[PDB]
């Protein structure tokens, strides 16, 4: 259990959802084995498998390092996740990395120019995945194209200039733990416990993070995890049964961030 210092569940719910990512919990305990935001998280993690907890050590450091949380108001868990993950992904690259091995995969984003109609193609990485509203399809196959226009034209090779174009993405390499995240600018968004993904590597749903309300910076986050299942909200720790998941698929309540560990 982790105390709420007033609208700081954006953290408590990511931390306990990373804590049930098995590979990642392990590498972090071995890091305090041998004073930045990584020593603070270790110092924290080192003290949860020990024995309700105040994470004030960690908060203190987080919002003095990044001023996007240093106010009374809420924040967005995925900002935090991606921040927290990247901010480890380089804190290590200084002193590929153990984070990279775990969460990193790649995707192909294809860029068809409209003057040449060249299907140019290049790749890029990701620690997490942000996708918009059936889950099964979004990974296996492609995005749906989004144009590039006013101030957002594409630089072409053939064209040697910036001309209008079409982007869309496809997972090119799944990672071990697939950090996954869903839009906001809500629905009935369906998501399974086991997931058939591209050698068909399929994934057991291990951790998830949900959101109550109707806009992602004034409501409330919680956490669901893999038990040796459990429901975690800030002071409370009560068990729940696997069928109490479909409840979260006006304030018609959805979910937010899915973690799929591999059956590997």
């Amino acid at each position: 259990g982790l105390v709420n210092f007033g609208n700081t569940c954006y953290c408590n719910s990511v931390l306990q959802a990373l804590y049930f990512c098995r590979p990642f919990r392990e590498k972090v305990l071995a890091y305090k084995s041998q004073e930045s935001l990584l020593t603070c998280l270790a110092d924290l993690f080192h003290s949860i498998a020990t024995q309700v907890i105040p994470p004030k050590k960690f908060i203190t450091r987080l919002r003095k390092e990044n001023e996007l949380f240093d106010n009374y108001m809420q924040q967005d868990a995925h900002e935090f996740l991606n921040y927290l993950l990247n901010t480890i992904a380089d804190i290590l690259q200084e002193e590929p990395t153990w984070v990279h091995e775990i969460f990193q995969g790649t995707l192909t984003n294809e860029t068809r120019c409209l003057t040449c109609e060249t299907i140019s193609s290049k790749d890029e990485d990701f620690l997490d995945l942000s996708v918009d509203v059936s889950i099964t399809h979004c990974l296996r196959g492609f995005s749906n194209t989004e144009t590039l226009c006013s101030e957002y034209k594409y630089y072409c090779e053939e064209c040697r200039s910036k001309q209008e174009a079409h982007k869309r993405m496809k997972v090119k390499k799944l990672p071990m733990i697939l950090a996954l995240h869903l839009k906001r600018f809500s629905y009935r968004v369906v998501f399974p416990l086991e997931l058939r993904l591209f050698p068909d590597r399929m994934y057991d749903l291990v951790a998830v993070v949900v959101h109550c309300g109707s806009g992602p910076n004034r409501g409330h986050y919680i956490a669901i995890v893999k038990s040796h299942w459990l429901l975690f909200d800030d002071d409370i720790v009560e068990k729940i049964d696997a069928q109490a998941i479909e409840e979260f698929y006006k304030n018609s309540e959805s979910g937010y961030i899915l973690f799929y560990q591999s059956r590997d």
Partner: protein, 579 residues
Amino acid sequence: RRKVQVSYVIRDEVEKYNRNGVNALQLDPALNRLFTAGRDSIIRIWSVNQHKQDPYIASMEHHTDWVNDIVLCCNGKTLISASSDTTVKVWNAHKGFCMSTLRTHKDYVKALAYAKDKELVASAGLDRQIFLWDVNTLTALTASNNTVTTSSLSGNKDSIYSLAMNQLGTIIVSGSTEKVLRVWDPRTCAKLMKLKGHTDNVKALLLNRDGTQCLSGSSDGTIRLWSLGQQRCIATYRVHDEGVWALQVNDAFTHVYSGGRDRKIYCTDLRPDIRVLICEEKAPVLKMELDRSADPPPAIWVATTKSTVNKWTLTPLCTQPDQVIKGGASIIQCHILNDKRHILTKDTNNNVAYWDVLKACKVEDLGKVDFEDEIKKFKMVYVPNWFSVDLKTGMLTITLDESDCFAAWVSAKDAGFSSPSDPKLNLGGLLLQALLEYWPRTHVNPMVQKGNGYFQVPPHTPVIFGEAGRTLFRLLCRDSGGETESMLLNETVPQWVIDITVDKNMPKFNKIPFYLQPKKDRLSASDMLQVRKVMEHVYEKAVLAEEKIELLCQDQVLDPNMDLRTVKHFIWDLTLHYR
């Protein structure tokens, strides 16, 4: 983003040959004249006689980016262009100069259109807007007073790539990235008909003299003939294998001529299984022009993404081109050598050349040496960035922005520039002084100086003022002084430039704080201070100090002609030890 930059181009006074591909063609049968419109902001003129050795007549130079479409009117008494610089310009096709400029478009102006009878024209672009202009006003329009009755036309969902008006000036249709073909009446701006049927992008439109039926070619690879009379497609036509970007039509309006990413120049007839493969061009086909010299159209000029424009004549029909209008190489790769005043290019002919960016000229050609190994044969120094480079015109277009134009400070010494002592000098700063060298406001004497004082930019070098897409103004360095080109300066050159060139108000130095220690010490200095001068400080904490002090970052020994920012940029708040 309505904030202003200053561009210039590195080029010979005259660029006889197209230094990048060609987007549009016009033909004057009256004077044997052909006008190409370049993907290098140049409309060049040509003579079509078998006579001419080099046909080249003149160059029409006023654009900044890809000229995309051109249209001759009043019998080629007046040409009208449209470009990626948002401007629709209006010329004198006979003499060869640019009367006026229309800045009403908000993005790349893609296609143009002409209804000869009513003498009205239309421009359209990626800003989804369609404009109408009555020609006899535009020919009476200037660079000082270009405010005219401009009719506007409304409806389009997305970015428009094609446009065409019937000969009578009664019908106009546009084709865009929505597969649909919106249609309007020109003399009223009123909408006529949608025209659903396609599955892709329509880069090409044509009409019959009455505009009763019309054609369309698309990036689905299909030519569709439409009966507007019945507001319906009446026939589809898959001759082509890739998207169709170019069309033309005979006087009878029966035989179609097309060409695409295919390169295949087929020609088919509505009477559609009698297809006539004319040729397979070496480059994707941008647009085409028929000869109406006499009906059974003799030959058809064809423009591609290749710098050279051929004429073809009327399993392949032809094999070799009947005409060759030659063309230049296109720079396609660049490199900035990190003294940040020199560049190495490499054109389509694999010619590597070394240029000077500050003086705005070529240092040399290096034949065809291995490019990526020539970039090595690589001084170990850091100067901050101050400019950026594009190759959209196939040429070195150089861009200066307020944000960091004034980053680069170097020593007169380290810039070659003589000094009977050694002063601190800002690169971009000298430059703006040197591009606006002939501008009489720049002729202020502080406590009559004209120029910067070390160098001059080549008088023929074009000076350009574009919003971070619209291009607001353009003149050559030498013509900075003409009264007509100078009321326009006071309208356009932005304050951030004025401050330096006109007021002669020089900008910030960059200091660098650093620690020094064999208790550390806090020092700061100009980011271009020679290491030598720091060892000179250690002694008191002049040549005698070369012998005595040794300076050391990250336990590496320091060259005492290095400036601090080199050190921090490479070896490495910065810290240095002594011995």
